[PDB]
Design a protein around this ligand. Structure first.
Ligand SMILES: [Zn+2]
Lengths: 58, 81, 76, 389, 97
DNA sequence: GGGAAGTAGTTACGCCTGGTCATTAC
DNA sequence: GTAATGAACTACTTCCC
RNA sequence: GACCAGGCG
C-alpha cells in the first residue's frame, strides 16, 4: 500500500484511483479516511470531494 | 458530531481498516473515521449520536469503549492541517 | 524467585509499578504531542486509579486490581 | 391474588398508593428512572423492559408474553406474605430436609460444560469473521467444509474443563468442589465416596445449622462428623439412603391435567378449594385432594407411573404437593395395609433362593420410597410385633 | 445455544447432534491408541474421551449437507457406562491390574 | 431535632500432609 | 515472538421531614 | 512464595 505525493491519496495499487499517474513516496505516516464526502464536514474543511483514504503530511 | 473511542495502542491502523470494512455490512450512517498515528490508543469517529457508535463498536475485541462527552472539532484542527 | 522451569516469579509491587510507569509515559507523550482535553482528562483518571490501588488495594468504592490468576493483588 | 374478604380489605388498603395514580406505561417510566438515573429518556424504557424480562422470576421464562404468569406467581407470593401476618400459616423451617436438594456430578459438570461451550462458540465466531474478512469471500465459498473445519481450536474447552476439575475452583466463586481421594485403606475411600458438605462459611458459629434434625433419621449418619470447626457442616450419608434422578416434567404435567384438575387461568382459587403444586409452582385447583393423593399413590403402587413421584398434602392450608425433580434423599419402607405387613415368608424364601430381586420387590408394590415430604403423613412402626391398625 | 451468527453477509451455522467416542490418547507423532486406567495413572496422563459435533451450514437460507468436527475431549468417570471397565469379569480386571 | 439508615471494624494458638501456579495473537 | 491487560454482631456518620 | 483442601492437640 502506497500514497500519491500530490493527491495525498493512500493507494493500495500501483495506480492512484483518482489520477492515472503512478506516483508514490513510501513515507506516509498519518491515515485519514472518509466514507461519504457529501455528509462528512471534515472533507468540507479539507476540500476533498472523493470518498476514500487520504494522508496529510507526506 | 465527533466521538472518541479507545483502542489498544498496538493495531490502531488496522482498527481503522476494519471499521471501514464493517460500515458496509449494515450500512451504518457514519461519515468519517480519524486515526492519526501521533495520538496513541484512541480514534475519532464521526456519527450522529451515541447509539450509532455503540452499534458500530460491538464485535471488535480491540475496541474497549467510547469516552463520554462530545469532542469539539475546535480541539483537533492542529492534526488535520 | 527463579523457578526451576526457567520462568521468573516477580512480586506484585513490581507489576503495579510497571503499570504505573507505562501509564505515566503514555500520558506524558500525549501531553507533549498535543491532544483534546477529553484524552488527558481520562488518562489522568486512569493514573489516579492506578496510584490509589497501588497504595491501598482495599479502598472503599473501587474495583480492586486483579492478578492474571484472578487473585486480588497484595500491596503496601 | 386472592378472594378472602379480609384479604380484599387489605388489598383495598394497599391499592390507594397506586390505584388512581399510575398506568401500565407510567410504572415503566418509574422503573426506567430508577434503573437508569439521569440517563437518556429512551434508554430508560429499554433498560427497564430488559430488567423486567430477564431478572424477575426467570424460571417462568424471559419472553414478554409470560408477564401475566409472572404477575400470578408474584401475587401468590404476596398472598403467602399477608397470610403470615394474620397467622394463617406457621413460618417455614429452613433446616427441614424437604426444603433442601443435593447437587451431584451430573449438574456441576453440566454447568462447567455450559461455560466452556459458551467460551468456545464466541472463539469460533471471532475466528470465522476474521478469516472471511482477511482472505475474502471467494476463499470461504470455494471449500465451505474446509473453511468450517480449520476455523475450530479444540483447546479452549479441554483446558478450561481440566483446570477447573484439577484445581477444584468452580466457576461462580464456589471452592472445594473436587477433592483428592483418600486412599489410606478400604473404609477411608468408601466413606470419602459418600460425603455431603454444606456451602456455609466455617468461621461463623451457625448454631441452628450445626444441630441435628428429626428429618435426618435414615438419611444422614448421626455420629460420623469431623471434630474441629467443620463439626456439623460436613456429614455422611446413611446406609439406607437413596438419591433420586429426574424424569421429564411435561409428561407428568399432562398426566396430572387428565384426572379432574382445572387450570389456574380458567378458575380463581377460593378458600373452599384445594391447591395443587408441581415442583413448587401452582398449576390448578381441585374440589377434593384427599381422594386425589390416594389415587396417585395407588397408581404408583400398581406400577402405572415411575416411583420417583412423591405426593403429600396439608389440610391446614388445603394444598397438595407433587415432586418429580432430582436431588432428594429417600429411604425405603414396607407398606402396611389393614394392620398387616405386605411382606410374607414366601417372599423372603423367594428372595433367598434367587428367583426374586430388590427391583422386583419395588415393582410389585411391597416396598416404596419416601422422601421428607411423604413422611409427614406417615406413622411408622419400629418392630414387626408393634404394628396395629 | 442454537447456532452461530457470524458477521458474514450470507452465512449461518446450525448445530446438530453430539456424540462421545472411546477413551483414547494421541501420541505427539500423530497416532491414536487405546488407553487403560493404570496406564493413565502411571504415565501421569488424563483419562478422557473425544467429543464430536455436527455442524449444518446454511447458505442464503438453505441448509447444506452436514459436517462433523471434533470440539475437544471430556474426562470419563471410572466404571461408568462409557468406561472401558464396564461389565468386565473379575479375572479380566485382574489381568488389567 | 432525636428517629431512621448506611457504612465501618472485628471474629484463639501452634503443627502435619498433599496439589497448583507463575497470559498469548499472530 | 513479544507487546500487549483483561454472617453475624457492635459503635459511628449521615441524614432528615 | 502465595493460594486450596484435609487432618492432629
Ligand atoms: Zn494520485
Amino acid at each position: 500500500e502506497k500514497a500519491c505525493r500530490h493527491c495525498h491519496y493512500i493507494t493500495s495499487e500501483d495506480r492512484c484511483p483518482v489520477c492515472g499517474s503512478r506516483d508514490l513516496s513510501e513515507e506516509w505516516f498519518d491515515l485519514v479516511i472518509i466514507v461519504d464526502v457529501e455528509n462528512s464536514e471534515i472533507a468540507k474543511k479539507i476540500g476533498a470531494k472523493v470518498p476514500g483514504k487520504y494522508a496529510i503530511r507526506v | 458530531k465527533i466521538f472518541a473511542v479507545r483502542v489498544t495502542h498496538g493495531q490502531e491502523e488496522t482498527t481503522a481498516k476494519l471499521i471501514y470494512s464493517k460500515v458496509r455490512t449494515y450500512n451504518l450512517p457514519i461519515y468519517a473515521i480519524l486515526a492519526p498515528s501521533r495520538v496513541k490508543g484512541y480514534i475519532f469517529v464521526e456519527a450522529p449520536n451515541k447509539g450509532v457508535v455503540d452499534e458500530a463498536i460491538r464485535g471488535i475485541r480491540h475496541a474497549r469503549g467510547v469516552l463520554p462527552g462530545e469532542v469539539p472539532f475546535k480541539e483537533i484542527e492542529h492534526f488535520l492541517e | 524467585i527463579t523457578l526451576e522451569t526457567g520462568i521468573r516469579a516477580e512480586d506484585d509491587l513490581t507489576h503495579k509499578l510497571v503499570d504505573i510507569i507505562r501509564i505515566n509515559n503514555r500520558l506524558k507523550q500525549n501531553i507533549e504531542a498535543g491532544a483534546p482535553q477529553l484524552i488527558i482528562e481520562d488518562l489522568w483518571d486512569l493514573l489516579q486509579y492506578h496510584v490509589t490501588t497501588y497504595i491501598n488495594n482495599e479502598a472503599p468504592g473501587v474495583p480492586p486490581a486483579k492478578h492474571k490468576s484472578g487473585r486480588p493483588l497484595k500491596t503496601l | 391474588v386472592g378472594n378472602d374478604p379480609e384479604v380484599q380489605q387489605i388489598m383495598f388498603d394497599n391499592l390507594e398508593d397506586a390505584s388512581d395514580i399510575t398506568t401500565q406505561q407510567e410504572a415503566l417510566e418509574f422503573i426506567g428512572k430508577l434503573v437508569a438515573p439521569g440517563q437518556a429518556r429512551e434508554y430508560r424504557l429499554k433498560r427497564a423492559e430488559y430488567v423486567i424480562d430477564n431478572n424477575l422470576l426467570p424460571h417462568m421464562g424471559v419472553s414478554p408474553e409470560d408477564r401475566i404468569k409472572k404477575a400470578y406467581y408474584l401475587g401468590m407470593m404476596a398472598l403467602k406474605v399477608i397470610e403470615l401476618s394474620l397467622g394463617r400459616r406457621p413460618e417455614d423451617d429452613k433446616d427441614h430436609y424437604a426444603n433442601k436438594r443435593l447437587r451431584l456430578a451430573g449438574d456441576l459438570l453440566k454447568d462447567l460444560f455450559r461455560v466452556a461451550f459458551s467460551q468456545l462458540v464466541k472463539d469460533i465466531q471471532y475466528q470465522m469473521t476474521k478469516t472471511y474478512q482477511r482472505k475474502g469471500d471467494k476463499y470461504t465459498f470455494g471449500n465451505i467444509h474446509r473453511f468450517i473445519r480449520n476455523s475450530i481450536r479444540p483447546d479452549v474447552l479441554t483446558e478450561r474443563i481440566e483446570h477447573a476439575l484439577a484445581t477444584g475452583a468452580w466457576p461462580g466463586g464456589r471452592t472445594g468442589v473436587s477433592q483428592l481421594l483418600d486412599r489410606t485403606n478400604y473404609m477411608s475411600t468408601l466413606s470419602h465416596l459418600r460425603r455431603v458438605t454444606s456451602p456455609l462459611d466455617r468461621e461463623q458459629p451457625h448454631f441452628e445449622a450445626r444441630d441435628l434434625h428429626g428429618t435426618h433419621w435414615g438419611r444422614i449418619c448421626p455420629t460420623e462428623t469431623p471434630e474441629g470447626p467443620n463439626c456439623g457442616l460436613v456429614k455422611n450419608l446413611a446406609l439406607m439412603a437413596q438419591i433420586t434422578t429426574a424424569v421429564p416434567e411435561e409428561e407428568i404435567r399432562e398426566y396430572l391435567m387428565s384426572l379432574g384438575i382445572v387450570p389456574i387461568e380458567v378458575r380463581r382459587p377460593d378458600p373452599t378449594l384445594w391447591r395443587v403444586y408441581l415442583n413448587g409452582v401452582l398449576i390448578g385447583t381441585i374440589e377434593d385432594g384427599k381422594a386425589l393423593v390416594q389415587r396417585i399413590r395407588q397408581d404408583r403402587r400398581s406400577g402405572k407411573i415411575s416411583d420417583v413421584i412423591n405426593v403429600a398434602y396439608y389440610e391446614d392450608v388445603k394444598e397438595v404437593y407433587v415432586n418429580s425433580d432430582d436431588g432428594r434423599v429417600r429411604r425405603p419402607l414396607i407398606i402396611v395395609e389393614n394392620g398387616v405387613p405386605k411382606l410374607t415368608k414366601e417372599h423372603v424364601q423367594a428372595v433367598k433362593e434367587g428367583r426374586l430381586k430388590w427391583s422386583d420387590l419395588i415393582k410389585m408394590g411391597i416396598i416404596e420410597y419416601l422422601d421428607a415430604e411423604e413422611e409427614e403423613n406417615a406413622y411408622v412402626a419400629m418392630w414387626p410385633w408393634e404394628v396395629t391398625e | 445455544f442454537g447456532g452461530i451468527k457470524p458477521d458474514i453477509p450470507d452465512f449461518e451455522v446450525k448445530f446438530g447432534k453430539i456424540r462421545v467416542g472411546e477413551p483414547e490418547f494421541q501420541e505427539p507423532h500423530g497416532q491414536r491408541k487405546p488407553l487403560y486406567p493404570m496406564d493413565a495413572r502411571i504415565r501421569n496422563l488424563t483419562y478422557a474421551a473425544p467429543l464430536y459435533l455436527e455442524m449444518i451450514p446454511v447458505i442464503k437460507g438453505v441448509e447444506q449437507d452436514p459436517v462433523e468436527v471434533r470440539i475437544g475431549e471430556l474426562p470419563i468417570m471410572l466404571k461408568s457406562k462409557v468406561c472401558r471397565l464396564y461389565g468386565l469379569s473379575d479375572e479380566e480386571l485382574i489381568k488389567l491390574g
